Ligand binder design. Sequence first.
Ligand SMILES: Cc1ncc(COP(=O)(O)O)c(C=O)c1O
Ligand SMILES: *Cc1c(COP(=O)(O)O)cnc(C)c1O
Ligand SMILES: *Cc1c(COP(=O)(O)O)cnc(C)c1O
Ligand SMILES: *Cc1c(COP(=O)(O)O)cnc(C)c1O
Lengths: 452, 454, 452, 452
Amino acid sequence: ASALACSAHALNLIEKRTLDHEEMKALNREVIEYFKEHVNPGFLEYRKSVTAGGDYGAVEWQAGSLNTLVDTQGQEFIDCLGGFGIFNVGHRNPVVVSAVQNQLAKQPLHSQELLDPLRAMLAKTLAALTPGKLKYSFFCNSGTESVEAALKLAKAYQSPRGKFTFIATSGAFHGKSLGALSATAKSTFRKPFMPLLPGFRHVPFGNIEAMRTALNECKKTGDDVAAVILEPIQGEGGVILPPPGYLTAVRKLCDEFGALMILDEVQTGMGRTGKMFACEHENVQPDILCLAKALGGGVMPIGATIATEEVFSVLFDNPFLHTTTFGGNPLACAAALATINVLLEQNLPAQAEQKGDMLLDGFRQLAREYPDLVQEARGKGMLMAIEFVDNEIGYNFASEMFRQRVLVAGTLNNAKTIRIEPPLTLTIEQCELVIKAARKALAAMRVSVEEA
Amino acid sequence: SASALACSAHALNLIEKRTLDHEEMKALNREVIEYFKEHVNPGFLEYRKSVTAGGDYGAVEWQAGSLNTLVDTQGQEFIDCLGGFGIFNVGHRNPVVVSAVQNQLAKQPLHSQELLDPLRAMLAKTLAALTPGKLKYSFFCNSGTESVEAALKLAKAYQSPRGKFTFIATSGAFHGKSLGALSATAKSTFRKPFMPLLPGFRHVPFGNIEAMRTALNECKKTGDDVAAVILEPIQGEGGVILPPPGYLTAVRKLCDEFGALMILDEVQTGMGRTGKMFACEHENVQPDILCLAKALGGGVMPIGATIATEEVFSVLFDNPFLHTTTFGGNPLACAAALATINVLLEQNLPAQAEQKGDMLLDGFRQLAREYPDLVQEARGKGMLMAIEFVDNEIGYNFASEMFRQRVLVAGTLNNAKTIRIEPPLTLTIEQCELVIKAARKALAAMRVSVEEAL
Amino acid sequence: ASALACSAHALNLIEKRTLDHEEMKALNREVIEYFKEHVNPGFLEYRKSVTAGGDYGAVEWQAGSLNTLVDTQGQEFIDCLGGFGIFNVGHRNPVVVSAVQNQLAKQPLHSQELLDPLRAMLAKTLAALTPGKLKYSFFCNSGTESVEAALKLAKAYQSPRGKFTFIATSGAFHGKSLGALSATAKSTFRKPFMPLLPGFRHVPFGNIEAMRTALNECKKTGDDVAAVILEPIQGEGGVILPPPGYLTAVRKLCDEFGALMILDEVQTGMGRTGKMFACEHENVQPDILCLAKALGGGVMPIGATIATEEVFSVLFDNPFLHTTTFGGNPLACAAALATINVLLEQNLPAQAEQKGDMLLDGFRQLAREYPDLVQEARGKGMLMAIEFVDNEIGYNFASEMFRQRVLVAGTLNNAKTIRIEPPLTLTIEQCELVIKAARKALAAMRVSVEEA
Amino acid sequence: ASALACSAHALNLIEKRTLDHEEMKALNREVIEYFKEHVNPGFLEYRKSVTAGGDYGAVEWQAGSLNTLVDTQGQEFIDCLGGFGIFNVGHRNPVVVSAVQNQLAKQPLHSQELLDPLRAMLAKTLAALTPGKLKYSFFCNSGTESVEAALKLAKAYQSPRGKFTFIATSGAFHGKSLGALSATAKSTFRKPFMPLLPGFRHVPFGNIEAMRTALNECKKTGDDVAAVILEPIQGEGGVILPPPGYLTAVRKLCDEFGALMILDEVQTGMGRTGKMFACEHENVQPDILCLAKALGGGVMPIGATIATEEVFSVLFDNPFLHTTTFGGNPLACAAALATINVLLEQNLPAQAEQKGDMLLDGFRQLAREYPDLVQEARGKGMLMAIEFVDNEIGYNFASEMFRQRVLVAGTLNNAKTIRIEPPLTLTIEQCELVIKAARKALAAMRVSVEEA
Ligand SMILES: Cc1ncc(COP(=O)(O)O)c(C=O)c1O
Ligand SMILES: *Cc1c(COP(=O)(O)O)cnc(C)c1O
Ligand SMILES: *Cc1c(COP(=O)(O)O)cnc(C)c1O
Ligand SMILES: *Cc1c(COP(=O)(O)O)cnc(C)c1O
């Protein structure tokens, strides 16, 4: 089976707008087959553990509307998954698609030698969009690249000052590339890949005393902390909100020891929590801010690491100290610029507050009626989670919701949690449908427990 | 000055424009320079200065002109002998890659990552078919440095249960800038500010099987057994360093003998550039893990791919979330890659890279004979070439004199005396000639400038 | 002069029991010069900062009585330094010296091939002397070597169980060799020698909640703690007593997480705090116990690492995994066997309880009279300390006690603190002289303060 | 039996000069039982492996003459083991014994506060005994401690110069404490205790071009070599001699790269290879020289780390940066001073050369005659080794020599290799008797093999 042949077959497919029954039967077969053979058979077994019958093999085909996805069988799903935080402004958002299309006609990828205007524009726009002294931007292609950039900026800055240790928090997720993975907290994701970067240590999230104890003990032993890295709200941890004033406290702790504050808003950024950045809630200015996911408007891959001139200036004397081939390419920038405009124009941060208040109320309500299955519902803005009592119940919830054509999924660090992360553009009727389908799934699950 | 809203709307409107007033052009250029200084990196403005003449430093990128040319905001058109450091193998805005991407953008650009996505499966089947021997499984990411992190993690996951933790790379090597990849990357400049890096990384001189065998033997004796060796078939940012014929095969045998894994970083050498689809096909070395990026995205999308045997990729099956990526293998990028593979094969671009590379290098080596004055030597394999000069400053002047002639070149990350020549594989034969003529005129100018300077 | 001439001159001096006034002048001259030129000019600077006038030049010549040292000028000192904790049964304790001579008559060092009986005899005595399941002994030559053996036993036991992290406490001193140094906590002793062993972390001494957090956080990130190591009371730290129930809580915490408990009793051991081992105040059984200093009766150098058979067994398959050339030699063992015998016959640990109480009563009294100069006095048995308001006041105390012919000295991890650490054999008569000497010292100190 | 009872019993044994037959049988029975239950049962298994019948349980009792040992049964063994390099001047050497007794009469251990004279005298004597600029001494208690001190000297010196990597050689043995173990090279000794000190790498012994490549690649990547450590002759490796001029080429390579040279003469030191130090053969001055074993005259444990003023001065500003409690105690200084005297007075390095050649000639003839059992014989001075065709043949040799009351034992990195390391004071008749015994042993071995 020649490689030309495979590529020609794929090009032929990419060009099909719609599939009929026999085309769908064949594409679904090839995709399951090739997943087993060339991608990961484990992912097939995973889908089985959160669906019922043939739903494991559901193959994603196209955007339906701003907030829906369609599989190869025409089945349309309401998206409460959001690509795990990617689709803040909806699927194929017309303003974003348009911007990308326009730039695609001029030049999608830059030479990396001439001065590329959209890099300059997005960095200007980001400077203005961010708190206080956050002034300089480095663009890359993902969240983990955003965090590697942050760790490196911290390292270049703190190294000549004698500081090499990094503090993160348990529950934290910061990416799976090996530097970012040193900060990431989940044991099962870390252990096979040890030894990781030396001098990374963890303290309980939300616990200012434990953090202070770590910075102070490190000082005593001559292992002074370079930087503290944390999410404002833990995402893959299961949507964990810290106590009030904790972020402000972590900011003061860091100034006190002369440590840098790195804030990872790859997941909480771009309006999802009810404000453009989750740090704007306590009005805290980190030294380095990590952005990705939704920054590309659900159309492009992109990441950005924004810092103070003070810190970022370590990159000035030699601008090749940290580089990236694709980072800040014109297509990625056009997507990011469109997304920032859409967010502001349509006041989507404010909408996420409003829609999130509604949905979490409906979720807390269902939690009360079904403590039979549901432990608790947490959230802020359109970042929410339902924590069930067992692992198996949460898997059954995902399964039942799937049958009702609502797409949800779990959390990387938390086995008992299903997330709810819809596009911020989710319509008021669609929020009603989601609570509706949530109830029905809970009811069906209850009935299954009595059934078994 | 403005709010983010006003800034985004200004950029959004500039994005829609196709051409520029003279006063619109002048305005934009002053913006780009100003914001590069205030919000990107003023040091980059300075680097552009040291490799240009006059306000050349502030040439601002506006659009692709043809397959092999770029146009700035002033309508100046440049023959691209930089190729985005190995990105534009099939040219700028190649119609088959643009079309595939545009068609997928109409369906779905990014996936949920939850449902099975069809193009991931197709690109994975296609790469299986494209790759030598037992390379069977593909992990998709967003960059070359991400590609190499995936390689290292795969090796780590496989070798740490077998009690092996040491990674051997080579000096001169460039494997990426993220902290995992940076640990294998070898340039002192790039490494020291971020130390300590990953433990267990050791380096031997490139292209020296004698030294590499000693390394692995010593590591075995002391109980610090070698998990994997990582190398580029040809060192790119190192200054286009060709290993002696026999090297890669010897590396394969050695890895076989000690039970080390062999990682080939073909992020720059891959997708046709050296005269084959992959530079390892030259000696027919099958690696345990193959890294791709740069040109795999067709010059339209960012993509990286890590391909490995089922034996090694295995480690990811029981828990498929052991290594993941949010954007990796998205439909837009998969389309761009499948398009690219098709074009490379249809238009037989690897074969073309061999013909055009022979001519171009033959041309440069002749010029080197003529100016021992300024040039040390010219080297290359297919369309991956470099010209080494006597001084960094002679080199910087070549880049500058070339830029004045509207031919784009640039240097290499681990060798300052070296100017890379990395044109699209689609560079026309006439353009090949033009580039040699441009290079000749530049060298003569340089000779005169050094004359008066002494 | 040749090496031979130097060896002969020094062999001549060793045979001399007493010095002419002229021989004395010349000896004190050569000793100061050779310290400068061949030992450490800096140790001469240190002594000056804690003596007055030419007192810095004092050169030690012989034991006087049990509790007494005599310099080269015939000047005699009551020893309240105890060699920083080695002279527990006094200077040249007759039973210990006798054991050592008798063994020297037979065989001072062993072959390491044939079975050396005194090693079997010492290992038997210590198994009988240690609480609970502590059963096997590895003999070495110092405290720091004793801690190295302990880290290795934990490493060899816990590495196959997937655990590599070590928790120690700030203020801790566990030795200066590079493995022990990784657990030793003073910044100033650690920085020039970094990178030390990886995987070592520090929590505050005496704070159990912080220790639970470190064990728990390590468990969460896959960095599971192999062992916890600590002194029951911190010596060099400044005689830092933990809360009641702390040591026991650490034992239960280790049990809970399946970490090994290492107890560093190099200073506290052999009767020093009022019991044979300080771990006996709460009846705590560590998995590994480290001994040295006083174990050699103030006559020989020796160390011992005692462990449960569960832990020590990691050395049975290949008894050559950890070894030492001089460890467990006949003279070291004779000395230790004599020391154990003397401590038990004369009920010396119990004496240390009584005399420590009485001595700490004198110092607490003086800290009452002189808040002028003194922060507080503390102690457990005969391991006591006086904390002063300043470093210099403490240095002044040390100099005044010296002028008063009572030998004291400072603590490695606390600059405001003067140890009082006399032989357990100190008479009540001398206890009262020591308390008078300290009052006179404070009297002169207060005066000199109000001169300025 | 109680701890007190155990100590009393041991003390009576220590007093008894002779043992009758059923005193022996009781003691022997004890020694084996206590080794089993409180020391290490594996030592019994190893000793069985290199003995025959009731030979495993040889229990040693006193020195016999200068060069012999007697066990509890009255069996006298000629000592070709030398305690693995300790007994350069024999067992209970009168001059060293007398120096020790005289010092025990005054002060066996010091306060560590007053200036102890014998530390100054030994440091002066060693300065005059050592090559060139080796001037300052740090005294400790073992070989592994003097390597520890050497690594720290280099670290303190090289850390501020930006260099942190250490190069050792495969085959090497430098001690078993975790710092020294990082440079020790046998896999068996290292693996279970990893992670060790970071930044330690190994190159093949005697191959200068391999060492240049490592030093050079390290520099390229920003991981510059702080220091190189090696033995002049590898001892535990199997008595591995380097090419002539290698040692000089390492000195020059270090000069060239600005790395420190550390020479480990813990085994080769104090006369054994024909000169006082094996570096004297090629006139090499290391920056740091390590000594132990024979430095203590076969009576005391001691170690020394001697360095140039350049290097050692990193300890002047803060003389407490590296310390050890027992290091340089009067008893150990007295034993070293006497050793230096005996070695020089009795011209014993010269004797080591003569007896070395004679013994090596003898083994070389036997190798020649029994190529069925013997691979080859190597050596320099009284450091020698016989390599056999396999392990078992080597073990049979050791066992046969033991039956003939000649004591030999293996090496820790090489299992086919038997070391021959007698006192430098071995008589010429004893030299001849060892060669005859080796012959009788080999003959019995060939015959043994014949039957099978
Ligand atoms: C608690 C403790 N551990 C370890 C040591 C190290 O003992 P040494 O100097 O004999 O190596 C000491 C010395 O102060 C000590 O007090
Ligand atoms: C999603 C996530 C990342 C992951 O980055 P990638 O784009 O998947 O490489 C990093 N940080 C946080 C907080 C995340 O939620
Ligand atoms: C460019 C390069 C990389 C890193 O690629 P990025 O996309 O810039 O992260 C890795 N390996 C090689 C050989 C490269 O040339
Ligand atoms: C024996 C040896 C050591 C270890 O000495 P110890 O006193 O047992 O700690 C160190 N270096 C060399 C060369 C040795 O032979």
